[PDB]
Design an enzyme around this catalytic site. Structure first.
Site, PDB file in Angstrom:
ATOM      1  N   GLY A  24      51.542 -18.174  -6.036  1.00 30.30           N
ATOM      2  CA  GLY A  24      51.807 -19.309  -6.882  1.00 30.30           C
ATOM      3  C   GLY A  24      53.296 -19.521  -7.016  1.00 30.30           C
ATOM      4  O   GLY A  24      54.125 -18.824  -6.436  1.00 30.30           O
ATOM      5  N   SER A  25      53.596 -20.476  -7.915  1.00 31.45           N
ATOM      6  CA  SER A  25      54.961 -21.007  -8.073  1.00 31.45           C
ATOM      7  C   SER A  25      55.932 -19.979  -8.610  1.00 31.45           C
ATOM      8  O   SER A  25      57.085 -19.926  -8.214  1.00 31.45           O
ATOM      9  CB  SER A  25      54.974 -22.259  -8.954  1.00 31.45           C
ATOM     10  N   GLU A  27      55.764 -16.839  -8.146  1.00 33.84           N
ATOM     11  CA  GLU A  27      55.834 -15.733  -7.241  1.00 33.84           C
ATOM     12  C   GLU A  27      56.672 -16.047  -5.989  1.00 33.84           C
ATOM     13  O   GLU A  27      57.066 -15.154  -5.244  1.00 33.84           O
ATOM     14  CB  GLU A  27      54.429 -15.272  -6.845  1.00 33.84           C
ATOM     15  N   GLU A  46      41.456 -14.437  -6.687  1.00 32.95           N
ATOM     16  CA  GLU A  46      42.077 -13.190  -7.089  1.00 32.95           C
ATOM     17  C   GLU A  46      41.094 -12.028  -7.254  1.00 32.95           C
ATOM     18  O   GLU A  46      41.513 -10.881  -7.098  1.00 32.95           O
ATOM     19  CB  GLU A  46      42.918 -13.417  -8.342  1.00 32.95           C
ATOM     20  N   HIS A  69      49.234 -14.811  -9.445  1.00 35.93           N
ATOM     21  CA  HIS A  69      49.926 -15.883 -10.111  1.00 35.93           C
ATOM     22  C   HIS A  69      49.656 -15.922 -11.622  1.00 35.93           C
ATOM     23  O   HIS A  69      48.560 -16.293 -12.066  1.00 35.93           O
ATOM     24  CB  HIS A  69      49.466 -17.234  -9.513  1.00 35.93           C
ATOM     25  N   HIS A 280      23.064   5.187 -17.799  1.00 33.87           N
ATOM     26  CA  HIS A 280      22.893   3.761 -17.710  1.00 33.87           C
ATOM     27  C   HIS A 280      21.726   3.349 -18.603  1.00 33.87           C
ATOM     28  O   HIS A 280      21.943   2.834 -19.700  1.00 33.87           O
ATOM     29  CB  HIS A 280      22.716   3.498 -16.216  1.00 33.87           C
ATOM     30  N   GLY A 400      29.995  -1.097 -12.316  1.00 30.53           N
ATOM     31  CA  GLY A 400      28.784  -1.884 -12.182  1.00 30.53           C
ATOM     32  C   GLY A 400      29.060  -3.375 -11.996  1.00 30.53           C
ATOM     33  O   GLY A 400      28.107  -4.153 -12.034  1.00 30.53           O
TER      34      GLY A 400
HETATM   35  C1  LIG Z   1      30.251  -9.459 -12.621  1.00 31.19           C
HETATM   36  C2  LIG Z   1      28.812  -9.164 -12.902  1.00 31.19           C
HETATM   37  N1  LIG Z   1      28.000 -10.166 -13.293  1.00 31.19           N
HETATM   38  C3  LIG Z   1      26.679  -9.915 -13.493  1.00 31.19           C
HETATM   39  C4  LIG Z   1      26.197  -8.644 -13.361  1.00 31.19           C
HETATM   40  C5  LIG Z   1      24.758  -8.327 -13.618  1.00 31.19           C
HETATM   41  N2  LIG Z   1      23.999  -7.875 -12.484  1.00 31.19           N
HETATM   42  C6  LIG Z   1      23.339  -8.722 -11.525  1.00 31.19           C
HETATM   43  C7  LIG Z   1      23.579 -10.178 -11.542  1.00 31.19           C
HETATM   44  C8  LIG Z   1      22.537  -7.940 -10.629  1.00 31.19           C
HETATM   45  C9  LIG Z   1      21.695  -8.508  -9.583  1.00 31.19           C
HETATM   46  C10 LIG Z   1      22.326  -8.495  -8.203  1.00 31.19           C
HETATM   47  O1  LIG Z   1      21.378  -9.031  -7.286  1.00 31.19           O
HETATM   48  P1  LIG Z   1      21.452  -8.687  -5.755  1.00 31.19           P
HETATM   49  O2  LIG Z   1      20.701  -9.778  -5.044  1.00 31.19           O
HETATM   50  O3  LIG Z   1      22.832  -8.495  -5.315  1.00 31.19           O
HETATM   51  O4  LIG Z   1      20.679  -7.313  -5.578  1.00 31.19           O
HETATM   52  P2  LIG Z   1      19.182  -6.870  -6.034  1.00 31.19           P
HETATM   53  O5  LIG Z   1      18.275  -8.037  -5.744  1.00 31.19           O
HETATM   54  O6  LIG Z   1      18.884  -5.675  -5.123  1.00 31.19           O
HETATM   55  O7  LIG Z   1      19.272  -6.475  -7.476  1.00 31.19           O
HETATM   56  S1  LIG Z   1      22.601  -6.279 -10.986  1.00 31.19           S
HETATM   57  C11 LIG Z   1      23.636  -6.476 -12.303  1.00 31.19           C
HETATM   58  O8  LIG Z   1      24.081  -5.596 -13.088  1.00 31.19           O
HETATM   59  C12 LIG Z   1      27.116  -7.631 -13.063  1.00 31.19           C
HETATM   60  N3  LIG Z   1      26.752  -6.318 -12.996  1.00 31.19           N
HETATM   61  N4  LIG Z   1      28.417  -7.902 -12.801  1.00 31.19           N
END
Ligand SMILES: Cc1ncc(Cn2c(C)c(CCOP(=O)(O)OP(=O)(O)O)sc2=O)c(N)n1
Ligand SMILES: Cc1ncc(Cn2c(C)c(CCOP(=O)(O)OP(=O)(O)O)sc2=O)c(N)n1
Ligand SMILES: Cc1ncc(Cn2c(C)c(CCOP(=O)(O)OP(=O)(O)O)sc2=O)c(N)n1
Ligand SMILES: [Ca+2]
Ligand SMILES: [Ca+2]
Ligand SMILES: [Ca+2]
Ligand SMILES: [Ca+2]
Ligand SMILES: [Ca+2]
Ligand SMILES: [Ca+2]
Ligand code: NA
Lengths: 525, 525, 525
Positions: A24-25, A27, A46, A69, A280, A400
């Site tokens: 960006g500007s 940078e 990003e 940026h 978890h 995650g």
């Molecule tokens: C940034 C972000 N947004 C949303 C989620 C929530 N999330 C989501 C949206 C999942 C489903 C991913 O689906 P996929 O098609 O990549 O795989 P599966 O069908 O095997 O679960 S698993 C999970 O924790 C997350 N972990 N991180």
């Protein structure tokens, strides 16, 4: 010398030669006169910039340097920073600020209260009080990212600083060496070793900081000496052990009661390079059963403080693993027996079971392949079905946060040009950082992307079934053509609707001279 | 068990038996049913509470536990927390919060955004999300305060939490042992030792973390083996070395150019347990002269990162000092010669020169006295004139914040009941935490307070002369009767207008069975 | 012009002529060449500095300017800032920072992460990015403190900035006028007025922002027109209404159920210039009873957002009170009847009941006296027994933080030299900011301090009895001689052990030409 010249000299003297960025500007005064010995890796958003840098840092085992940026660019990267915080990734995140003379008026592109923006996801966050301080602040950023526990740091620099005169005393920064390669004192280490030697049924649990330290081979020696089964701590961001070694017992379930049951009858459990524990699901019960005590070796005070049980030692994982492996006695107990191979799941001539995909990847990939996982409903099967003999062979979003694996796989492939990277990504997860594909095409970074297309957020759907939750919206993602997205960003694309086509697609992809995306039609859950 | 019962069990199992406090409404549910094995030390204002706890923790070399009232009580303590941050003091600061059911409405006594209040002066700051989490959060606080680099931490607890049922799995917290007693790996330690052995003219610089670690005797052995002069790093919060040992060279001047000139001709300078460096006046020049290289051993990543020069090792000071002292060769160079005694300054039968005061204290005090300094214009003379042979013999406000020494001297005296504490405090500084005197009277803690009364903020007046600053207001503090203030809070008081009266007052004070304040009429600067 | 000259010109052009301060090294370049038209008011500890400034700002109804030393000085003031946040006090808090060239190394006296230190107790917190920005940042601080809702702000300035050249365009700052004197639009105001006119049994509740706005007389007109009883919102920091006016009904109990019961049968309750509500004890029940609706007029969005019931209007209290008073109809209902005078409590020739003290103060004090309250167990009786006819006649620590009234009473007396200030402070509370007495002596500010000495933290003891809490430590404060403390700081002191001596002491104190402290022996609870 200018602040620009002095800062690039510091970076090169500290081993940095690549800038991952989206410009960006604010940078442009940093990026101008870009030195010939540096590489700039552009990504189009990003989250992608930081994901690529993160994979590069994790695989290289060295800091990666990022330029973004102002506030909007930093902000676009903060989901990527959550993963980087959990993986202890040494990332030097720099962002440009407005010229000092208009910060007060809050001109367009001013990053207001800049150092607070990436908190709480950085170890150190700063904007210098003058241009001549910038090299010293950059030195602080480098060392803060790199000392144990490694992690991301943030530096905001007003754009007018770069052309100002540097302090001549900044040369003392260039060659500073900072070490955190430390281990427990001899007396206390002897006490630990005696406890391990006198355990009747020890178990070992390993986390991602083992792989970050390249302590994997020392951990193999340790496990062989102690005759001990080895599990990977839950929610694993990396693979710290050869998955077909006879001691290996796989990925721990991410639940309190499940883990204490698994450890029952083990008198001493030694955890190395993991939080205790990255649970978890909420699976309440005993943290440990009667008869089990836990000892954790961690590089991170925050992990030692928050463990709900056990003793802890805060030290470098490389130094501690090497010392333990070399000091413990060879137990006369029998070496654990290897886990049996996984069963073949029945597979018809239609859509692919994930188990088939993983078995086929294991059959066809090189022995030194590197896998990334963002196929969130299939992680347990992946861990059972891929023989990963070498360090640095697996990455999964440590917080995650989806959007990591696609860009990170590009960074890993850049770090490891002779090891084929294969990213296994769900159709849901693939969208978060989809534009990262363009960087693979432009720089010809030959990552293979395997998109597991089942039309849904399967990990979420499964959990909704778990809570018996009816009428949850937003779980389906129909109507995405991943071959067209790959074409959009210049990546060769293939589709596999059945096993014959999966084998044929993987054969082509493995032969290809550039990145390749394979869209795999997988079974709906 | 209740959260109350479980938390006091955790505290006692972790070695905590004293609560330093000033109570309020939100804290009564914590303090009720106060256990018989604990002591409560009341002070009348929170700067005093924290100062007393800080002196106690620094002298005991163990964490101190504090209980304050909500935001206003925490806020009153934050100047004391700035000093504690700089001294790496292991302080567990707890504050009571409103009942969870009225936090939302912001009832009177709600601590809004509580964890942000003491930032940036704490290592960890937290308010638990439920009552059953409180013991685990307290466990985190204990360990975070206690792990290297030690420092203050903050925990806010809603008052209704204490009577709730505890989690039965909280018992796993009670006996956790967490170690940061680590040293550099053998290979790199051998490289360091060889560098020290092959130095032609080494110098040693020691900071406060040496005294905190009780590494003083190891540092003496190290200095004797290397035949090296020893200085104390500038702005010194503690005394890390016997001040009449032949290697000792005194307190370094707190200026960049002054220090590089002092170190000129020393080829290797080993800094242990100090920031590099706590400069004060701006004295620009070279950080080091050509021919000098610096190696720092520090317990604090933040110190290693911000040093403008030298290599660094981040490790425990006790473990590193012991290892170095025992591994280096005995050099065949001649041992340094002791510094000559200071000259006697001419003294008439009128107001006392500070030099006379210090010489008289050195003549009359026991050899195991402990001194505190908040006589800010006389620090250099103090350091020259007091023979401090033993560890734990000197404390000075580590952030430069006045209001430390008066309360801290009480805490130090409580920690060290057999060593006479003598706090030398200017008339200006004495006011900041004057009410702490009451705690000494009530608990009969026999600290001696020597008030250096020259009528002015002398350290400021001197600096105004330095900048040639005319018309600075607010530098004079006439009209304070310290004997009346001492009487106000129940402390025996004496006045010394000349040397005869100073000797007579010190003789009485040294004989006394309780705390004593001596107001000394000192020369105006 | 220099930054120094430009900044003092801005301050004087914006009506600021007094600096409340405790100086340090980083502040001397600001304070040097102190302008002849400014006053510097020294206090000996920063809680005292800010308390004095706070009383001055609250009574003057204009911003007060403060200068403190770096982090330790700011930190010492943060309990005072908690009160100032709750009272909406317009305080401009400045602190000196290290020279920009040593901020990076964290030289002694560096305020690290300065703007985060006073958060969350300030409306705006900032350190400028260059010296030439300082006047603009000061302009921002002035206006941020002064706009509704008023409150404290924080500005950190590196000491080297003051001598640098100012931007010539800074002259545009000098005469800026910023208004927040706003009221509800005509259409919606007419709807509100019609609701008030058609209420069958309206009630009015007033808070401290009424007195801050000098809206008291408008609120009297409003209450007379509506024929409505008037209560003061709970935990009252100020007195917004004449306490013997026939509509007045006193201080509301600080409990949810108590307030809804009090308001039962009132169909419309209009709250002006208060949070809804500053409850204290947890007294669960209905927020309002069926049949009562609430409308709040508040200057503070945070108050409007967090009210658990009612409608709200966010506007200036002065403008809204004036508009309502002048627009509502004169109701034909009968004017409320004045509350009866309080009963005389039986009093023997021994220690004083608090009720006797208040009745005697009411008998002897001028009609335009100003009272401050930090006698925490006696607030209800104070409110019943003092006839306060005029605005600006009462102050109580708005966050409940002790240490406010003693210094604030000095600031109020400085603001109101023709109104006798009488601070009624418990023996416990008097210690928190005891050194403020010295400022009254030095500047001959003739505040009267009445110390209610009952030997204990009575408000706490009472609450312990409420929870049936046994064995609470730290509730007694024996052994303080307040006449000796007053002598220590140069204030005339008297003692009253019985009613005859109380009358005699008050007669002397009221006749005196300087500050006076009276220690009153009050009955133990
Ligand atoms: C940034 C972000 N947004 C949303 C989620 C929530 N999330 C989501 C949206 C999942 C489903 C991913 O689906 P996929 O098609 O990549 O795989 P599966 O069908 O095997 O679960 S698993 C999970 O924790 C997350 N972990 N991180
Ligand atoms: C909390 C706080 N406030 C103000 C200061 C500034 N300060 C002050 C006020 C000093 C003068 C102390 O005077 P003294 O009488 O205690 O000793 P000298 O006369 O020997 O300087 S030295 C110094 O840095 C400070 N460091 N800390
Ligand atoms: C800064 C601070 N610390 C502690 C308290 C707790 N506190 C204390 C210590 C009170 C007792 C004050 O005693 P007093 O002698 O001034 O008056 P009473 O005896 O009438 O209660 S009331 C109260 O809330 C507080 N509110 N603010
Ligand atoms: Ca196979
Ligand atoms: Ca999917
Ligand atoms: Ca002598
Ligand atoms: Ca002095
Ligand atoms: Ca009367
Ligand atoms: Ca009392
Ligand atoms: Na803060």
């Amino acid at each position: 010398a200018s602040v620009h010249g002095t800062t690039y000299e510091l970076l090169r003297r500290q081993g940095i030669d690549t800038v991952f960025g989206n410009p960006g500007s604010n940078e442009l005064p940093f990026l101008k006169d870009f030195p010939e010995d540096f590489r700039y890796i552009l990504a189009l958003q990003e989250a992608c910039v930081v994901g690529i840098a993160d994979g590069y840092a994790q695989a290289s085992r060295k800091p990666a340097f990022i330029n973004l940026h102002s506030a909007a660019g930093t902000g676009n990267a903060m989901g990527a920073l959550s993963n980087a915080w959990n993986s202890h990734s040494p990332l030097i995140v720099t962002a440009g600020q407005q010229t000092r003379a208009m910060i007060g008026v809050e001109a367009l592109l001013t990053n207001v209260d800049a150092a607070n923006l990436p908190r709480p996801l950085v170890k150190w966050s700063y904007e210098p009080a003058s241009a001549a301080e910038v090299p010293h602040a950059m030195s602080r950023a480098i060392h803060m990212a790199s000392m144990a526990p490694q992690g991301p740091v943030y530096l905001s620099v007003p754009y007018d600083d770069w052309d100002k005169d540097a302090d001549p005393q900044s040369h003392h920064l260039f060659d500073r060496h900072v070490s955190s390669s430390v281990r427990l004192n001899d007396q206390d280490l002897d006490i630990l070793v005696k406890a391990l030697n006198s355990a009747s049924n020890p178990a070992i649990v390993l986390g991602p900081d083992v792989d970050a330290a390249n302590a994997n081979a020392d951990c193999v020696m340790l496990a062989e000496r102690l005759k001990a089964p080895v599990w990977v701590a839950p929610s694993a961001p990396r693979c710290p052990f050869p998955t077909r070694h006879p001691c290996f017992r796989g990925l721990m379930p991410a639940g309190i009661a499940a883990i204490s049951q698994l450890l029952e009858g083990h008198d001493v459990v030694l955890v190395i390079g993991a939080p205790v524990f990255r649970y978890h699901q909420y699976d309440p019960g005993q943290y440990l059963k009667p008869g089990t005590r836990l000892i954790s070796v961690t590089c991170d005070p925050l992990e030692a403080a928050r463990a709900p049980m056990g003793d802890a030692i805060v030290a470098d994982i490389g130094a501690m693993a090497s010392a333990l492996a070399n000091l413990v006695e060879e137990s006369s107990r029998q070496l654990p027996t290897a886990a049996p191979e996984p069963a073949k799941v029945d597979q018809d001539a239609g859509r692919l079971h994930p188990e088939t995909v993983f078995d086929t990847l294991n059959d066809m990939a090189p022995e030194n392949a590197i896998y990334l996982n963002e196929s969130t409903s299939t992680t347990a099967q992946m861990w059972q079905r891929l023989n990963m003999r070498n360090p640095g062979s697996y990455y999964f979003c440590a917080a995650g946060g989806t959007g990591f694996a696609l860009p990170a796989a590009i960074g890993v492939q850049l770090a490891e040009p002779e090891r084929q990277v294969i990213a296994v990504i769900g159709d849901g997860s693939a969208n978060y950082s989809i534009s990262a594909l363009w960087t693979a095409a432009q720089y010809n970074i030959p990552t293979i992307f395997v998109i597991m297309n089942n039309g849904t957020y399967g990990a979420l759907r499964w959990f909704a079934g778990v809570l018996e939750a009816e009428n949850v919206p937003g779980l389906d993602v129909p109507g995405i053509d991943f071959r067209a997205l790959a074409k959009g960003y210049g990546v060769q694309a293939l589709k596999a609707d059945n096993l014959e086509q999966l084998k044929g697609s993987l054969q082509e992809a493995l032969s290809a001279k550039g990145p390749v995306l394979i869209e795999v039609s997988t079974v709906s859950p």
